[PDB]
Design a protein around this ligand. Structure first.
Ligand SMILES: Cc1ccc2c(C)c(C(=O)NCc3ccc(S(N)(=O)=O)cc3)oc2c1C
Ligand SMILES: [Zn+2]
Length: 257
């Protein structure tokens, strides 16, 4: 099955998922000089005051912090979006070393990690239907650099020991994702895809310009997770990122001058 190694990693995915070579694949390199400021873009509206986290899960590729998405409790609106997108989960991609780990790049710069807050368009009723539509998902991407600790991340870091291996989950209630957001909501946006199989071309990407800082100790704890299940040979969960894909016929738009 697919993963991140020599024999099952990103360069192999197209065999099972031919859309891997499609026209709107993610991630991409964001060339900051060619991205055009679009004064028609609205401020992003991130309304996470009522977010209800439920659980954290090691799915063998990353860990997901899951939310109750059965009502309009945490939603993303505005920006490039039409209508209302509900938060379902967040996860990260990260590296074996601080110099890699992000999926998007900025002028070819790789960050240590990238946070993806995943939202689905409520006009399609649920997530499985939304992924079948070109405007089904909105993923808010936030870069992580290593420096000062992010206090709002620590609750996530400290539960990881309890979900070391694939298929483990833990109750994870009352986690406030507002604590993971940088000061500025300036962003780039473009039409793309899921960055893991099935690689569906259903995502409006919104990538924040301002990274958050996390500590070396925080990211080191991400790197102690395992891709393998309990009672299997240890494979550290590192380098779970897809490299930048061809931009093809797309334009990246900036919300800021
Ligand atoms: C076997 C199987 C069959 C179908 C699906 C679908 C339809 C998804 C899916 O939609 N996963 C959610 C998802 C959310 C966000 C991202 S990201 N990194 O933010 O672009 C990537 C993937 O996973 C599937 C699996 C694992
Ligand atoms: Zn992701």
């Amino acid at each position: 099955h697919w993963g991140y190694g020599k024999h099952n990693g990103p360069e192999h995915w197209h065999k099972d998922f031919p859309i891997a070579k499609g026209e709107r694949q993610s991630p991409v390199d964001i060339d900051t000089h060619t991205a055009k400021y679009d004064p028609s873009l609205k401020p992003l509206s991130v309304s996470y005051d009522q977010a209800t986290s439920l659980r954290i899960l090691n799915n063998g590729h990353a860990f997901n912090v899951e939310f109750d998405d059965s009502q309009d409790k945490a939603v993303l609106k505005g920006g490039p979006l039409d209508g209302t997108y509900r938060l379902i989960q967040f996860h990260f991609h990260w590296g074996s070393l601080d110099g890699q780990g992000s999926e998007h790049t900025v002028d070819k710069k790789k960050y240590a990690a990238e946070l993806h807050l995943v939202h689905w368009n409520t006009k399609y009723g649920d997530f499985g239907k939304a992924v079948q539509q070109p405007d089904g998902l909105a993923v808010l991407g936030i870069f992580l650099k290593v420096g000062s600790a992010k206090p709002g991340l620590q609750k996530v870091v400290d539960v990881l020991d309890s979900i070391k291996t694939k298929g483990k989950s833990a109750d994870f209630t009352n986690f406030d994702p507002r604590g993971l957001l940088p000061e500025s909501l300036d962003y780039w946006t473009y039409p793309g895809s899921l960055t893991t199989p099935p690689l569906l071309e259903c995502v409006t990407w919104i990538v924040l310009k301002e990274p958050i800082s996390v500590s070396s100790e925080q990211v080191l704890k991400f790197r102690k997770l395992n891709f393998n299940g309990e009672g299997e040979p240890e494979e550290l969960m590192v380098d779970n990122w897809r490299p930048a894909q061809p931009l093809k016929n797309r334009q990246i738009k900036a919300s800021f001058k």
